[PDB]
Amino acid sequence: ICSARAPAKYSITFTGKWSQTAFPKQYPLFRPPAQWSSLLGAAHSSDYSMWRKNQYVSNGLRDFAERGEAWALMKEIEAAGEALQSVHEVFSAPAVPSGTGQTSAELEVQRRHSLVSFVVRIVPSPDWFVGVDSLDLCDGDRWREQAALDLYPYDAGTDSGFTFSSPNFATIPQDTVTEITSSSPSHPANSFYYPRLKALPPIARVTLLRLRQSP
Amino acid sequence: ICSARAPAKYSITFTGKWSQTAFPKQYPLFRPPAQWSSLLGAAHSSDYSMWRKNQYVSNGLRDFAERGEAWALMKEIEAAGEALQSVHEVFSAPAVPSGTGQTSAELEVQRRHSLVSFVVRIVPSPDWFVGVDSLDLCDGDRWREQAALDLYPYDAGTDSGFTFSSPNFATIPQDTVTEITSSSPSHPANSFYYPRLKALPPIARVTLLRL
Ligand SMILES: [Ca+2]
Ligand SMILES: [Ca+2]
Ligand code: NI
Ligand code: NI
Ligand code: NI
Ligand code: NI
Ligand code: NI
Ligand code: NI
């Protein structure tokens, strides 16, 4: 029930927090070193879903989650806008070439498309990523000034590899998106299995800040 | 002088042409495979320069050209826009995980900022990249409907490695940006050294279309 009179510009700042200190298990040091893919996202309405927990990822997202290929996903978003007018604009931020680091982009939301979603692939990984699914920046007739979120690893459900550098192994039948925790999947061989922790620490963080580039 | 009355939106499509067919010499196939970094650029005026042949790269651009680290470069572009009125907006496109893939983004230019510049790092490489320096999309009171350019490799002048997969080696003292051609540099193993060719084929292509 958003009633925001005018659109609003926001800066989205992604912070990678995948350090060896925070996540020592099987930490990728070379060929390739721990890093992140480009950040791809969009401002949209509830009629469009880039991804959702417990839902199958689109072929476009599968390609992005497994190889950082963003073209098919970009075409899907473009097609969604043409078919259901569910997308205001697509945005992206440069990839972070290391475990820790930052990257940013500017986006615009409007009452009709006040939701923001984005995905960033964990490199290297079978099909693991982080992101936000339909964060609503509108709160009635006003735009939220700021949104700070902790990000946790997700499994696309397309590749069954157990570790960051595991060779490709298609998941059949295909599974749905699942959140990866310190206890699930449960096995010493799994990259994020830390039985001594109550929960995994955030692997990344993101901040949406309403910009003041005009009155 | 640009007298265009209103701003204009453009799509920018980057198409890689770094194929094993066109560039058979030491083509990167493993750890990591030939590919492109994210594309980073900006709509700006002549008071801002992202890069230019025979000029030293900024600290931000050194980081980007050598490791694909774009934070500092993005901060430089943003600052120029906020403090010097020289940048209208920064734009970026997703990285291309193959030498022949494609990526795109949308950008806006206006009479006060009708130029477009961008850089894309060649991966892997010592400090090589492709890009455009100050392409003017305005033509008097009209906006150009389209502009397409073939792109060739450039050297940032900060790392002296001779090949795509060469380990880091600082260029001391630092050199300025130079174009890489089929005849120069001419180190036996220089990745783009093809003594028999009149010139290198384009390694990429960029197309700007008014929306
Ligand atoms: Ca999986
Ligand atoms: Ca060099
Ligand atoms: Ni925009
Ligand atoms: Ni805008
Ligand atoms: Ni814009
Ligand atoms: Ni704008
Ligand atoms: Ni815009
Ligand atoms: Ni290097």
From Swiss-Prot, chain B:
Give the highest taxon in the source lineage: Eukaryota
Primary place of residence?
Answer: secreted
Gene Ontology cellular component terms for the protein in this record: extracellular exosome; extracellular matrix
Q: Which UniProt keywords apply?
A: Calcium, Cell adhesion, Disulfide bond, Extracellular matrix, Glycoprotein, Immunity, Innate immunity, Metal-binding, Secreted, Signal
Q: Give the tissue specificity.
A: Expressed in normal lung tissue but not in lung carcinoma cell lines.
Instruction: Quote one Gene Ontology molecular function term.
Output: antigen binding
User: Which residue numbers delimit the Spondin domain?
Assistant: 1-188
One of its GO biological process terms is: positive regulation of interleukin-6 production
The UniProt annotation places a divalent metal cation binding at E108
Pinpoint the site Important for metal ion-dependent interaction with integrin: E108
Q: Where along the chain is Ca(2+) bound?
A: D127, D155, D159
The protein's location, in the record's own words, is: Secreted, Extracellular space, Extracellular matrix
Q: List the disulfide bonds.
A: C2-C138
Q: Main role? A: Cell adhesion protein that promotes adhesion and outgrowth of hippocampal embryonic neurons. Binds directly to bacteria and their components and functions as an opsonin for macrophage phagocytosis of bacteria. Essential in the initiation of the innate immune response and represents a unique pattern-recognition molecule in the ECM for microbial pathogens. Binds bacterial lipopolysaccharide (LPS).
Q: How does it assemble?
A: Monomer. Interacts with integrin.
Protein name in the entry = Spondin-2
Q: Which organism is it from?
A: Homo sapiens
Gene name for this UniProt entry = SPON2
Q: Which residues of the full protein are shown?
A: 34 to 244 of 331
